[PDB]
Design a protein around this nucleic acid. Sequence first.
RNA 1: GUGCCGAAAUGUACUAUCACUGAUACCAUAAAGGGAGUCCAUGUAUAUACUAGGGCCCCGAAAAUGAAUGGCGCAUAUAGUACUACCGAUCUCAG
Lengths: 52, 124, 196, 179, 175, 97, 135
Amino acid sequence: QKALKEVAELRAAQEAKRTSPEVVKAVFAEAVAAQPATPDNMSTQIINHIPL
Amino acid sequence: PFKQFVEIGRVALINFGELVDKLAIIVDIVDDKRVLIDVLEFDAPRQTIPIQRLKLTDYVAKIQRNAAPEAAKAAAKDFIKQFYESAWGKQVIARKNKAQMNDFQRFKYAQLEAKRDALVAKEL
Amino acid sequence: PIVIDAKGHIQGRLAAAVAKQLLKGRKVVVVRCEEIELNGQHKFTVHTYERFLNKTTNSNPRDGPFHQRAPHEIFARAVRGMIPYKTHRGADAFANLQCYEGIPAKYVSYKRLVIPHALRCVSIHTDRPTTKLGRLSTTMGWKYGNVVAQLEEQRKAESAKYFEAKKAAQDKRAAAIEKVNKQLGAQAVKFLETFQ
Amino acid sequence: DAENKATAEGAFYVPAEAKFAFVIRTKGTNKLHPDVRKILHLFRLNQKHNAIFVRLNKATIEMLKRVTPQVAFGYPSVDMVRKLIYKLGTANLNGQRIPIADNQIIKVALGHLCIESVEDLAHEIYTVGPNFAAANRFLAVFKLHAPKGGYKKINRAYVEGGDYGNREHLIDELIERMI
Amino acid sequence: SLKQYLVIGRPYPTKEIPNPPAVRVQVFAPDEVIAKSKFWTVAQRIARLKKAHGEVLAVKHVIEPEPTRVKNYGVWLSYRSTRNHHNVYKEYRDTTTEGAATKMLAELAGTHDVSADNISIIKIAEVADKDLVHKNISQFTHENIKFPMLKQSIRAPTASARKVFAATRPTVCGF
Amino acid sequence: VKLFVPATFVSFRRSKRIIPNQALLEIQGVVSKEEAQFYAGKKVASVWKFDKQEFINWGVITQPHGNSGVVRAKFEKNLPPQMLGKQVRVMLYPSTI
Amino acid sequence: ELLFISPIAKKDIKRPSWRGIPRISFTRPAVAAKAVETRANLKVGTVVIIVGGEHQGKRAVVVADQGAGIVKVAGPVPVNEISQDYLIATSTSIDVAANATEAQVEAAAAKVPEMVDYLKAPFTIKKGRIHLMKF
RNA sequence: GUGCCGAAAUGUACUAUCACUGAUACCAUAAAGGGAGUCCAUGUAUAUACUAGGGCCCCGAAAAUGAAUGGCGCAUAUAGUACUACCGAUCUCAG
């Protein structure tokens, strides 16, 4: 019960790092970087009729 | 004609949920069904709320959209005074005072009401 | 013994509320059974009832289900479905009910409760059509619909003369209560109104 | 600190995988394939709401792939492995299903294997030391009651909004309320 | 409820190629265990990486920089209905990316009647008021928005104080 | 033994189809799960007259049932079906508050 | 005691021990709770509602606390002994040091305005809720 | 499973729906083919014209005793989606 108080503190001390303003904006910048480029056109088939 | 619209900077008495019975101002709109709201008595975090669990009053603060906390609280200082002074807002305090009433005080209220009803019955 | 002003209400919503509190063991009048209002257009409500008229026993109509056209026994039938009426507890419970088209001379004096979640405002949307029970019954042949309206007019005149007297009592009661606030005190008035 | 070192460097600390598991039988006996109840008889999970600790290797994991619809299982933390054995722990001695009571029970069975008292037995589970299967066989199967939230859907997996199969760390959330 | 997650995974080292390319997937799931399984679905389907030979390195939980204020969210998705696949760009107004994604799973299941099994999102991102092109959401970015609350609720202010009678009749008017 | 809060005997505990060891009572003025937790523990008493011999039946409250404030309740002689509808007395001891 | 429990050296085969664990004899040689506390928030001289037995709806002041969960009541209409089962603690607390003395309770309550009228008054239940009644 | 019959939220949050109509696996039937009904929507051209389509709803849809979403009835008790509380077997657990 002394040890499980210490382990409760150390696991809670990680949540201070996780929810810090410095660390969260880095993770959100990684998530914004991860997403793909914007598609110009939707629809199943583009259809191209170039001569020859 | 509807008088009282949902608007940026309007005071509202939230009827439903964990924040029931507490005045709060609508700092930003989001949707048809929902609003961002700032609670002024309690000091919770501001958060999204449905408008249907909200209900409204006449009074309106001059504020910008997504106002700062405490800055928007200064705008509401006139209207919370006008709310609790008005007779619709007296029933908010009466429910609250009655709710916290304790044993002995309920005997005091019963005895003063007997003295009230005795002296009224004379004048007929 | 409760009385229920059933104007504004929905038929099934009221009947579900009423049938539950009969089984809890409580006597319950409803009144103004004709101004209960169903969902649907007048076309649609009639076609529902015309299907119900077809349902007869073929060997002979006399043993057939009876088709009550009065609003006070259309509503009573809708309640009878929701109670186990063939058992002794249900038949005792169903005997405690009362419906009246137009509030009669007995129950004018009683205080009239209005069960709020069965009101047609709360349960139907805006911009969808509804019809009364009286309108439907007259169409289905009820012959006393006209008579009830005449009676309502006579009553609601006499109900108005009650309120003009009851204003005059309660106004001079407030002027009497204006005096007694000074006799108790300044701080005693706060304790009655606000609660300290 | 090994995690927070790698983030400051650049890298990822991937953790060590789970050395053992804890396998509740969720569904009962009947309407069941004979291969898939041979496999449950090998884990000694015959009745509904029974559980033991099972060591994880490619033998036992591939057995658990066959029986995934019948069981909920995951990787319990040390506080959960403790709290099972102190409360509900029993020793299956000479096929008798005896309650654990006192440490002189488990000294007599397991003292030659250097496991003296109930702290040493619980340790031999969660570290998965060399005499694990002695210590696991010594424990009778646990017998749990159906939990005080209920749970949503027997017949779907946890991964698709249900119950059965692997739930990794969140078995601890289940066992708290089973106890 | 759904929480945005970033998951990075890789294949095991062969002796032919130690240190391969890892790959990341944005996924939306209630907890860390489900987020792994959504990663292995997308990794297998596209980049040809199976559960049975691959690590998974870091389940990062994306929390918002600020949930204090409202943002617009474009959501490019495909959804599949029997006999055809449709591509749709839909957008929403919400406090966070997750609450926008939770909205559209309800809206597609409502409007089009397709489940989250059939749906496959391409791109979520926050979007400015200038680049926003849909009319019903553009109205909330303007100033001087009034709408009334026509149709009030009748609920209990607290669940203790509910009742099934009333003397007076409730008024459900907006006012 | 006067002083009680009125409470109807609304039903036996039952499934859909099957129902007498325990009973359900709707205590007057109680409408919530957290509201009805106060009356957990407390002692009910049924009473009835035989002409000139007024008997009493106890009567206890175990747990709340559902979200309507209905509460479960044993009696020492479990109730007859003729009581369905009628009142009983929920006396408010033993009160730890 | 659970000492003298020893493992059998037999290896009979009728009964087999699968792992290292061996069958246990479980034999000895032939030769041969609860505190029930007093309840907190019942001090010396708290005003209390009596709801059980002989007195119902009658308020009383606790002259002194006997201990073991039983307290002896005093007041106008007095001196009885009953457990915390039959008592409800009000917030109000009249200052009385002394044990029993029925005369001192009315004398002490004469200090506090209309507390003597409060104590002699019955407590009763009406139309329109004890759970919500904050005491 | 939780309007009432019927034990248990007409629960909270979010989208569709007006039709003599719809309503929970096995299951107690409905298709090809249509619709400036309504909601959502793809690509182009100049607020407007031209359509890639998708749901829900309508038409297509006729049998003999009077007739059955189980009934009453409902129209936010209909069609989907998400999250908690709750009732419920001779299973499970405790004695």
